[PDB]
Swiss-Prot record:
Underlying gene: nagJ
Name this polypeptide is given: O-GlcNAcase NagJ
Family to which the UniProt record says this protein belongs: Belongs to the glycosyl hydrolase 84 family.
Biological function: Binds carbohydrates. Capable of hydrolyzing the glycosidic link of O-GlcNAcylated proteins. Can bind and deglycosylate O-glycosylated peptides from mammals.
Note from the entry: Metal-binding observed in X-ray crystal structures is artifactual.
Length: 165
């Protein structure tokens, strides 16, 4: 007839903004979600930088895979390859100029340690760009259950210093 209760796969868009005041999900388990920006913030043309954007705060979610998307400048900088620590695995994939995706995952056995280097994206300084403001938004996290708690974000900048003269 039509015996159901669970939901296999039923996702929708609903882009349009505008919402009312109504609570459907009892209780509250929303995470703060925050990115950890740690780097020297200074490179020199012909060199590479390593800005490990990890977690600054994540309460109410078990981030197993944190894939972020940094936004740099192709005219000045040049994406190369993402890195990780001596336990977590990282892999970036150039999707656009001055902007590429990164795939992070803890291949250590334990959840994301957070508050440390979760993933660093190296942008080849093949051309100076003093003050080339960069940022990592849409930073998501793979909870232990399966849902992804879109975490906050943070901005950064790096000064490319000319080599010779």
């Amino acid at each position: 007839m039509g015996s159901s209760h669970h939901h296999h796969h039923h996702s929708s868009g609903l882009v349009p903004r505008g919402s009312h005041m109504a609570s459907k999900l009892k209780e509250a388990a929303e995470v703060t979600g925050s990115v950890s920006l740690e780097a020297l913030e200074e490179v020199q043309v012909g060199e590479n930088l390593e800005v490990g954007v990890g977690i600054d705060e994540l309460v109410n979610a078990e981030a197993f895979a944190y894939d972020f998307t940094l936004n740099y400048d192709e005219n000045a900088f040049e994406y190369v390859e993402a890195i990780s620590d001596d336990g977590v695995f990282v892999n970036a994939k150039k999707i656009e100029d001055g902007k590429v995706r990164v795939l992070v995952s803890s291949l250590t056995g334990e959840p994301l340690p957070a508050k440390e280097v979760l993933a660093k994206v190296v942008l080849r300084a093949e051309a100076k760009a003093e003050g080339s403001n960069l940022s990592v938004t849409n930073s998501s996290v793979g909870d232990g259950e399966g849902l992804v708690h879109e975490i906050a974000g943070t901005e950064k900048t790096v000064n490319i210093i000319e080599g010779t003269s």
